[PDB]
Design an enzyme around this catalytic site. Structure first.
Site, mmCIF file in Angstrom:
data_model
loop_
_atom_site.group_PDB
_atom_site.id
_atom_site.type_symbol
_atom_site.label_atom_id
_atom_site.label_comp_id
_atom_site.label_asym_id
_atom_site.label_seq_id
_atom_site.Cartn_x
_atom_site.Cartn_y
_atom_site.Cartn_z
ATOM 1 N N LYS A 63 0.814 -1.217 0.000
ATOM 2 C CA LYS A 63 0.000 0.000 0.000
ATOM 3 C C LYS A 63 0.849 1.268 0.000
ATOM 4 O O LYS A 63 0.463 2.276 -0.578
ATOM 5 C CB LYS A 63 -0.938 0.013 1.205
ATOM 6 N N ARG A 140 -9.655 19.039 22.785
ATOM 7 C CA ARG A 140 -8.696 18.636 23.794
ATOM 8 C C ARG A 140 -8.762 19.607 24.973
ATOM 9 O O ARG A 140 -9.376 20.670 24.874
ATOM 10 C CB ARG A 140 -7.290 18.553 23.203
#
Ligand code: NA
Ligand code: NA
Length: 326
Positions: A63, A140
């Site tokens: 890949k 976050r």
DNA sequence: CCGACGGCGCATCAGC
DNA sequence: GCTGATGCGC
DNA sequence: GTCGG
């Protein structure tokens, strides 16, 4: 970011394996590959090069070759355009909605948040909370806010009973500049592995945090584990703070520090420490540290009254959480 | 070749 | 109703 | 998908 294109690709593949194909082990294989590549200090030139890294095998090398030569991956391009699959993958971003729920929703025409908002009757309590704070949960938490949060948690806990012992663990404890949520480990001398848990030691703390309006919602709550939502008080005339995920675990006094050690991490450090312990004749899990006989028979758990006690047993020098990145 | 890949608390489902 | 399995998050 | 007994 030397190989950001590659790591992004592997992570996207990881998510589809987990959320759509429901192949958790492939999800983890891709994550592991992305991580090992994310740390590689060289811009990868070929799949063969990457295959040298532990976790990168034949398929991912292939890949990477396709990605390096064409700038993309046909399989990933195709899945991205797939209405059903991209929708299933997406819905799992809602806390409470896993692969099974996401699939059923998409199967009946429910593919977007908007769709979810229109079908409250088909969502359980957790999922509704997840939908409600979809964006907040993906944000976050600045260490500064984590400190303000810890301040409230430590104060209220001590207020309920000054004998409670509470520790905010996770990367935060290691000194991270930002966190994804707040993980709190709680104990009380009255609670041990072979004693009563006075089914309320955790309850009394959760209650006090709700009373001062810190905890705003509850995802789950039992005698030893609480998972919910909290929010810092907003200063008049200022945009209110985003809601945050917070978990609180009540752990027996005699297993507290094995718990704090474990939930402080990092995961890499925990493995390394577990390895070292084995070669030293000790087996360490999240609850205890036990001796191993010459035939591999684990003895009873050893007394632990601090994180250092654990290090001392395996003749390892006590290391600050700040130095436990690995 | 082929099994491991962590595993447990809680909410809820599925079988009785 | 009770018991064990499943989904989910971590 | 990758590793390893
Ligand atoms: Na490899
Ligand atoms: Na989810």
């Amino acid at each position: 970011t030397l190989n950001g294109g590659i790591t992004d690709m592997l992570t996207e593949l990881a998510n589809f394996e987990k959320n759509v194909s429901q192949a958790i082990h492939k999800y983890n294989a891709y994550r592991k590959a992305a991580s090992v590549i994310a740390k590689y200090p060289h811009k990868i030139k070929s799949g063969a090069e990457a295959k040298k890294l532990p976790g990168v095998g034949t398929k991912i090398a292939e890949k990477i070759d396709e990605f390096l030569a064409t700038g993309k991956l046909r399989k990933l391009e195709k899945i991205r355009q797939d209405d059903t699959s991209s929708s299933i993958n997406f819905l799992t971003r809602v806390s409470g909605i896993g692969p099974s729920a996401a699939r059923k929703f998409v199967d009946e025409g429910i593919k977007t948040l908007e769709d979810l908002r229109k079908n409250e009757d088909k969502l359980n309590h957790h999922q509704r909370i997840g939908l409600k704070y979809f964006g907040d949960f993906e944000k976050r938490i600045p260490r500064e806010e984590m400190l303000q949060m810890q301040d409230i948690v430590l104060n209220e806990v001590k207020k309920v009973d000054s004998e409670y012992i509470a520790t905010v663990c996770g990367s935060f404890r290691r000194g991270a500049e930002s966190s994804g949520d707040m993980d709190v480990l709680l104990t009380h001398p009255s609670f041990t592995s072979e004693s009563t848990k006075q089914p309320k030691l955790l309850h009394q703390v959760v209650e006090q945090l709700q009373k001062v309006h810190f905890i705003t919602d509850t995802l789950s709550k039992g005698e030893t584990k609480f998972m919910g939502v909290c929010q810092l008080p907003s200063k008049n005339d200022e945009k209110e703070y985003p809601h945050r995920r917070i978990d609180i675990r009540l752990i027996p006094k005699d297993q507290y520090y094995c718990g704090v050690l474990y939930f402080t991490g990092s995961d890499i450090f925990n493995k390394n420490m577990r390895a070292h312990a084995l070669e030293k004749g000790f087996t360490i899990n999240e609850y205890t540290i036990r001796p191993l006989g010459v035939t591999g028979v684990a003895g009873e758990p050893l007394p632990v009254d601090s994180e250092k006690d654990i290090f001392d047993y395996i003749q390892w020098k006590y290391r600050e959480p700040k130095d436990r990145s690995e």
